[PDB]
Structure formats: C-alpha cells, structure tokens
Amino acid sequence: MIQQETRLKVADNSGAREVLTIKVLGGSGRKTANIGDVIVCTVKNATPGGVVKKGDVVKAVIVRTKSGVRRNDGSYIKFDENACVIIRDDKGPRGTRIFGPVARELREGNFMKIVSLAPEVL
C-alpha cells in the first residue's frame, strides 16, 4: 500500500537508491498502489556515477511491498520492504540489473524484462 510521500528502495542499478512517491497513476483520486503498479517519483538518494540523478522525476514499477498481495487461490505473499524499479516508457528497466525477489504479478503486468532479470520470482 504505497501512497504519495511513501519512500521506497530502488531494487536496481539505475543509480537511484531511494525514491519518494509523487503520484499513484491510474485514475483520478486513486490513493494507493501495490505491486505491479506504476508511480511517478523523485529520487531522494542516488549512487554517485549512476545514470539516474538525485532530484530526477522518474517512473517506477512497484516490485515488493510490505502490504503484499493476495492471490486468487487464497494464498498471500508479503515482503519485508517496499521496493520499486525505475522504468522506461516501454516498461523496460532503466538499469541493467534487478536486485532481490519480485512478485509474479509483474508477469501479468507485462514487465517481462524485469521479471527475467530478477534473481528470484515468487
């Protein structure tokens, strides 16, 4: 359950380390986003030398949340952290590597490249 002002770890090597959520995309008055949703965000913290710089306004797909997600079979998945991956306009990641496990819902979202790069898909 990610809303405006939520901070998230960046699970990639794009250069961003932590982002602050500016907007939940996908409708007027939409309050929260979860795994597989896209957010507009600003980079609060970055690794020196990366492609993405501090203060950049970028788009990210949520890949892990503490809230987790519920599945049609009544099972659940939850993570210890809220993490996102910075994406291009075609849903491809800005970086070249993904870190940490990601939820399978990314497949239904068609973030296939992120899913492929992810070390584990749960």
Binding site: G68, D73, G74, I77, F79, D80, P101, R104, E120, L122
Partner: protein, 114 residues
C-alpha cells in the same frame, strides 16, 4: 465443534495427506505454478511462523530470506495448490506466533533444532 452444517458441507474439502508440523519447523512446500498451460512445482522453504484458524479455513505462514529480503508466504492449509509439504526440520520455540523473527536477521534469527 464449529457449526455442524458448516463442518458437514466443508468436510470433503479437507486433505488427509498433510504431515504434522508446528511453528518453528522448517518446511519445504511444493507449490503448483500453473502459469498459462504449463505446470511446474516451485519449492518454498522456510520456517513456520504462524498457524491460525480451524477446519477448511485454516492457514499457515512460512518465512524465508531471499537475496537478503524476507519473504512470507501464507497458504490455506487445505489448498489443492500445494502438491505436498515436507518437514525438513523441527524447531524449538516457546510460543505459537514467531512474529519477533521479522525483526531479526542472521545469527540472531536462528531457531534451535529439536
């Protein structure tokens, strides 16, 4: 019991091939992934931190550290999507809910074996 009619109508949903286990036991849960038409078994291995409910509604939760990130999977105990459960290890704990492990990492999060 619970209400007789609820039990009577849900009796056939219960599975009889599940091993005994307790919170703190390490489990290997073989889960059927049915993406598209292809079916495969993915194993989720972790410590049982929670069991709750009764009858067909019962659930359990298993916790693992994956790539340095904790991951918790909660299953209906009688879901047909679990092919089988293996009790890899019996843990020694002092309480039913192991929520304190969520805040522990590394050697601090180790469960003594029985």
């Amino acid at each position: 019991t619970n209400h007789k009619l609820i039990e009577a109508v849900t009796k056939s949903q219960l599975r009889t091939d599940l091993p005994s286990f307790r919170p703190g036991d390490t489990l290997r849960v073989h889960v059927r992934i049915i993406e598209g038409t292809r079916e495969r078994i993915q194993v989720f291995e972790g410590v049982v931190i929670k069991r709750r409910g009764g009858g067909v509604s019962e659930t359990f939760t298993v916790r693992k550290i994956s790539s340095g990130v904790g991951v918790e999977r909660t299953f209906p105990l009688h879901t047909p999507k679990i092919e089988k459960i293996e009790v890899k290890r019996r843990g020694k704990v002092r309480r039913a809910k192991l929520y304190y492990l969520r805040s522990l990492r590394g050697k601090a999060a180790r469960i003594q074996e029985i």
